[PDB]
């Protein structure tokens, strides 16, 4: 249904002070606001394309797209990842009457284009659409500017439309784009392409958004009237520091807005074998609660994802860490306590609880760092004539202390006269048996419990998470992750010889100063990215825009 239709390297220009949008949906009137967000930097490189030459271009964090035209050549866009009917794609078209927006699964042609010849023709965009989760309809003299973003499942489009007369270039000036649409499409986007309406000339400029700090000025009508890019030159930085658009004569010690970290490196030790989650998780027979089992875990890649298709945990509670940050940490020492209790007593496995299990059988400290996992096991621990193989302790003279065990079987004396064996009137045997039948209510069915307790300290890592390492970048401002220790700064070689076991060394200010590379045991040291001794000599910004730097 579609056909296939010498190229030259595209030229470049600068978006002088264009491409400012509204960062958020709040309403502000008559104020100066300092924001940090994804913006188009001033005097930044835009690619000037055009002859048709429709390429597929990257979509990094957002896109500023500008077009100058006289006869409505530019029609719409397509956004996606593969654009090949194996994933979902977004299509925005304007067929001279309406605005069509479709999130579907298109099989796009290699060179899409609409058709004009003089009613209409040649709708040679795609071949077939299948699933179509989202549908939306609405039934040189011009400069059209757009900013596209997508975050948290929303695709946001901002736009502006101004009349121009200068012909063959993107004019210098200032533009603030008003919000246009906000569609809840919820797809992944990495590439995009534009649709041209053939006749059988116009240009577009493409630039990309980057994280920056801006100073914005809000009108009475909450229309952004001025903006300052605070990483451009020293005058912009001193305007940003004072939060003003004018400066008088002075010296003006300034702050740091000029350097942004770019790369992120990860360094983990060379551990390959996975953890035995499956020999401590199915493990035909578990242990009684009063004689619980403790086991050490070492030399592991602790992957929790190999348990998704086997067990369904009713309870997963971590205390000193966050469950979303277990894939980035290396631990030094890890234990595992396992036992079996009744369904209603799983609430007592927590720091600070009381009852029967937490008083006489198993107790947790107040300052506990670890996770507790529980799951129902009626299919493995319950039998027809009951399963009288798990015991528990009911009578004790005094409460336990954290991580203490008591396997004694004396005769508890509840009355006055001594017992000396011979469990009579006020003498009891202190251990009783759980009876697990397969017809029990959920309150007293068997549950298997595993408690993991790990520590992080200045020592080699034994068990670590499933994160892939990468290359080392030196003499640059990077984020780094060494053995689960994160930071920002510049990595350079040094000579501060460590102890055999030492992993990192701090300084007097209790900030990390040197670190040891895990794979190649070589010391490095960390210095700040910021230079904090720069001053800007300026006359009045009214008289002139020249500065000197000290």
Ligand X SMILES: *[C@@H]1O[C@H](CO)[C@@H](O)[C@H](O)[C@H]1NC(C)=O
Ligand Y SMILES: *[C@@H]1O[C@H](CO)[C@@H](O[C@@H]2O[C@H](CO)[C@@H](O)[C@H](O)[C@H]2NC(C)=O)[C@H](O)[C@H]1NC(C)=O
Ligand Z SMILES: *[C@@H]1O[C@H](CO[C@@H]2O[C@@H](C)[C@@H](O)[C@@H](O)[C@@H]2O)[C@@H](O[C@@H]2O[C@H](CO)[C@@H](O)[C@H](O)[C@H]2NC(C)=O)[C@H](O)[C@H]1NC(C)=O
Ligand U SMILES: *[C@@H]1O[C@H](CO[C@@H]2O[C@@H](C)[C@@H](O)[C@@H](O)[C@@H]2O)[C@@H](O)[C@H](O)[C@H]1NC(C)=O
| DSSP letter, residue 488 | E
One of 221, 246, 270, 322 touching ligand Z (CB under 6 A) = 270
**Interface map 287-326 toward ligand U (x if CB under 6 A):** ----------------------x-----------------
**Interface map 160-199 toward ligand Y (x if CB under 6 A):** ---------x--x---------------x-x---------
We find the least distance from the C-beta atom of residue 322 to another protein, in angstroms, to be 4
Tokens read off for 199? 């006749």
Determine contact, residues 19/64, Cβ cutoff 8 Å. Answer: yes
270 contact, one of a second copy, ligand X, ligand Z, none, CB 5-8 Å limit per kind: ligand Z
Binders of ligand X in range 394-413 (CB under 6 A): none
What is the three-class DSSP state of 184? coil
What's the CA gap between 410 and 253, in Å, rounded? 78
Q: Which among 55-63, 380-388, 470-478, 502-510 is the span making contact with another protein, rule CB under 8 A?
A: 502-510
Q: Which among 76-84, 204-212, 325-333, 416-424 is the span making contact with another protein, rule CB under 8 A?
A: 325-333
The dihedral built from the CA positions of residue 238, 243, 246 and 252, taken in this order, carries a sign that is: negative
55 contact, one of ligand Y, ligand U, ligand X, none, CB 5-8 Å limit per kind: none
We find the least distance from the C-beta atom of residue 475 to ligand Y, in angstroms, to be 26
Q: C-alpha dihedral over 69, 73, 78, 79, to 10 degrees?
A: -20
C-beta neighbour count of 518 within 10 angstroms = 19
One of 519, 543, 545, 546 touching ligand Z (CB under 6 A) = 519
Q: Given the complex with ligand Z, which of 501 and 531 has the nearer CB atom?
A: 501
**Interface map 4-33 toward ligand Y (x if CB under 6 A):** ---------xx-x-----------------
134 contributes a contact to ligand U by CB under 6 A: no
What's the CA gap between 154 and 169, in Å, rounded? 32
428 contact, one of ligand U, another protein, ligand Z, none, CB 5-8 Å limit per kind: ligand U
**Interface map 422-441 toward ligand U (x if CB under 6 A):** ------x---x---------
Beta strands (DSSP E) in 230-385 are 263-267, 293-297, 300-301, 315-318, 330-331, 333-342, 370-376
Query: CB burial class (10 A; 0-12, 13-18, 19+) of residue 384?
Result: exposed
97 contributes a contact to ligand Z by CB under 6 A: no
174 contributes a contact to ligand U by CB under 6 A: no
Residue 202: closest CA among 109, 67, 105: 67
What is the three-class DSSP state of 343? helix
We find the least distance from the C-beta atom of residue 454 to ligand X, in angstroms, to be 22
252 half-sphere exposure, CB direction, 13 A CA radius: 26
One of 23, 115, 250, 351 touching another protein (CB under 8 A) = 351
Q: C-alpha dihedral over 497, 500, 501, 507, to 10 degrees?
A: -20
Determine contact, residues 7/53, Cβ cutoff 8 Å. Answer: yes
Q: Given the complex with another protein, which of 321 and 523 has the nearer CB atom?
A: 321
We find the least distance from the C-beta atom of residue 435 to ligand U, in angstroms, to be 8
Beta pairing class for 17-21 and 174-183: parallel
What is the three-class DSSP state of 443? helix
What's the CA gap between 462 and 297, in Å, rounded? 9
Q: Tokens 């309150």 identify what position?
A: 443
What's the CA gap between 429 and 374, in Å, rounded? 29
309 contact, one of ligand U, ligand Y, ligand Z, none, CB 5-8 Å limit per kind: ligand U
184 contributes a contact to ligand X by CB under 6 A: no
Provide the binding-site residues for ligand Z, judged by CB under 6 A: 270, 519
Name the site residues for another protein (rule: CB under 8 A): 253, 320-322, 324-325, 328-329, 351-352, 366-367, 456, 484-487, 507-512, 527-528, 532-533
Q: Which residues bind ligand Y (CB under 6 A)?
A: 13-14, 16, 43, 81, 95, 97-98, 100, 130-131, 139, 169, 172, 188, 190, 397-398, 401, 407, 409
């Amino acid at each position: 249904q579609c056909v296939n239709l010498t190229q030259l390297p595209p030229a470049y220009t600068n978006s002088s002070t264009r491409g400012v949008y509204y960062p958020d949906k709040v309403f502000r009137s008559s104020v100066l606001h300092l924001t940090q967000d994804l913006f188009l930097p001033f005097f930044s490189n835009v690619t000037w394309f055009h002859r048709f030459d429709n390429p597929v271009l990257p979509f990094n964090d957002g896109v500023y797209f500008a077009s100058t035209e006289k006869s409505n050549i530019i029609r719409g866009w397509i956004f996606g990842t593969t654009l090949d009917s194996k994933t979902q794609s977004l299509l925005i078209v304007n067929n001279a009457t309406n605005v069509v927006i479709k999130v579907c699964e298109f099989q796009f042609c290699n060179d899409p284009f609409l058709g004009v010849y003089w009613m209409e023709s040649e709708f040679r965009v795609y071949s077939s659409a299948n699933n179509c989760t989202f549908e939306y309809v609405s039934q040189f003299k011009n400069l059209r500017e757009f900013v596209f973003k997508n975050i948290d499942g929303y695709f946001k489009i901002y736009s502006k439309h101004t009349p121009i007369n200068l012909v063959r270039d993107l004019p210098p000036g200032f533009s603030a784009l008003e919000p246009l649409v906000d569609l809840p499409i919820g797809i992944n986007i990495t590439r995009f392409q534009t649709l041209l309406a053939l006749h059988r000339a116009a240009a577009y400029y493409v630039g990309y958004l980057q994280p920056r700090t801006f100073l914005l000025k809000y009108n009475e009508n909450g229309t952004i009237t001025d903006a300052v890019d605070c990483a451009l030159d020293p005058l912009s930085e001193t305007k940003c520091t004072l939060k003003s658009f004018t400066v008088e004569k002075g010296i003006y010690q300034t702050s740091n807005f000029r350097v942004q970290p770019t790369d992120s490196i990860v360094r983990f030790p060379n551990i390959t074998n996975l953890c035995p989650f499956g020999e401590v998780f199915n493990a035909t027979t578990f242990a009684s609660v009063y004689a619980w089992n403790r086991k050490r875990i070492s030399n592991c890649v602790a992957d929790y994802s190999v348990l998704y298709n086997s067990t369904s945990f009713s309870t997963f509670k971590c205390y000193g860490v966050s469950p979303t940050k277990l894939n980035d940490l290396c631990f030094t020492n890890v234990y595992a306590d396992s036992f079996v209790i009744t369904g209603d007593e799983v609430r007592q496995i927590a720091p600070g609880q009381t009852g029967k299990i937490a008083d006489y059988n198993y107790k947790l400290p107040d300052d506990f760092t670890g996770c507790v996992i529980a799951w129902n096991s009626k299919h493995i621990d319950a039998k027809e004539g009951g399963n009288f193989n798990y015991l528990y302790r009911l009578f004790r003279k005094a409460n336990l202390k954290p991580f203490e065990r008591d396997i004694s079987t004396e005769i508890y004396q509840a009355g006055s006269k001594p017992c000396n064996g011979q469990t009579g009137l006020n003498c009891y045997y202190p251990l009783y048996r759980y009876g697990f039948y397969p017809t029990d209510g959920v309150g007293h069915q068997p549950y298997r419990v595993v408690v993991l307790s790990f520590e992080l300290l200045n020592a080699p890592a034994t068990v670590c998470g499933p994160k892939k390492s990468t290359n080392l970048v030196k003499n640059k401002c990077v984020n780094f992750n060494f053995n689960g220790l994160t930071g920002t700064g510049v990595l350079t070689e040094s000579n501060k010889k460590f102890l055999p076991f030492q992993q990192f060394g701090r300084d007097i200010a209790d900030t990390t100063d040197a670190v040891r590379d895990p794979q190649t045991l070589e010391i490095l040291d960390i210095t700040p990215c910021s230079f904090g001794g720069v001053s800007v000599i300026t006359p009045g910004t009214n008289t002139s825009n020249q500065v000197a730097v000290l």
